[PDB]
């Protein structure tokens, strides 16, 4: 719809600190382009960061393995999150059904 096939990983409930960088690594370990538009802190004392990356349409359909690593000061061990499109799934035509409200609901006006 928008030609914006980007993928991001969001971090929540972490401490409101600085020096946070989100780098995307593929299955071969090669690096990708960086990102901008860093978010700010929330009134609930929770930090928010988003890592933006640009991939190709054909790469996503090939089921490539993409890993987002979290780099936070509190956690010394960077966790690995794997995001990939599950290949081998069948395609079905969706059926749209509209259910009008029943006569028992149109009583209280």
């Amino acid at each position: 719809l928008t030609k914006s096939t980007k993928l991001t990983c969001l971090v929540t409930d972490l401490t409101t600190y600085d020096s946070v960088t989100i780098s995307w690594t593929r299955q071969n370990g090669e690096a990708v382009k960086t990102h901008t538009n860093i978010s700010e802190s929330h009134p609930n004392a929770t930090f928010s960061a988003v890592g933006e990356a640009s991939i190709c349409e054909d790469d996503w359909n090939s089921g490539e393995r993409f890993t987002c690593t979290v780099t936070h000061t509190d956690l010394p061990s960077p966790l690995k999150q794997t995001i990939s499109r599950p290949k081998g799934v069948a395609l079905h035509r969706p059926d749209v059904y509209l259910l009008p409200p029943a006569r028992e609901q149109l009583n209280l006006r």
Binding site: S19, V20, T69, T71, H72, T73, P76, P78
Partner: protein
Amino acid sequence: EMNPNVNVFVPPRDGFKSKLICEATNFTPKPITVSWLKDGKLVESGFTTDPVTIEQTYKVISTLTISEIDWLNLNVYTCRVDHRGLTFLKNVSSTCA
């Protein structure tokens, strides 16, 4: 002819950019070469070597400039010391990890 001791210092657990210091002590003769490694890759810039001082024994100290983000990324830093044809490698990482 005594093998030099290799020691690598790490930033404090509760916070400090920072610097990495590799110290070789009680080595002979005076000439010695000290370098730095980053994830098995040669470092071309960002490191300096102080003049060798006399503590007969000698002392040599090297300083490597690092960033907070790189240190917390669990990157492997190795201090390479060459002395009398022998190479010593010391690997360090985050203690709290």
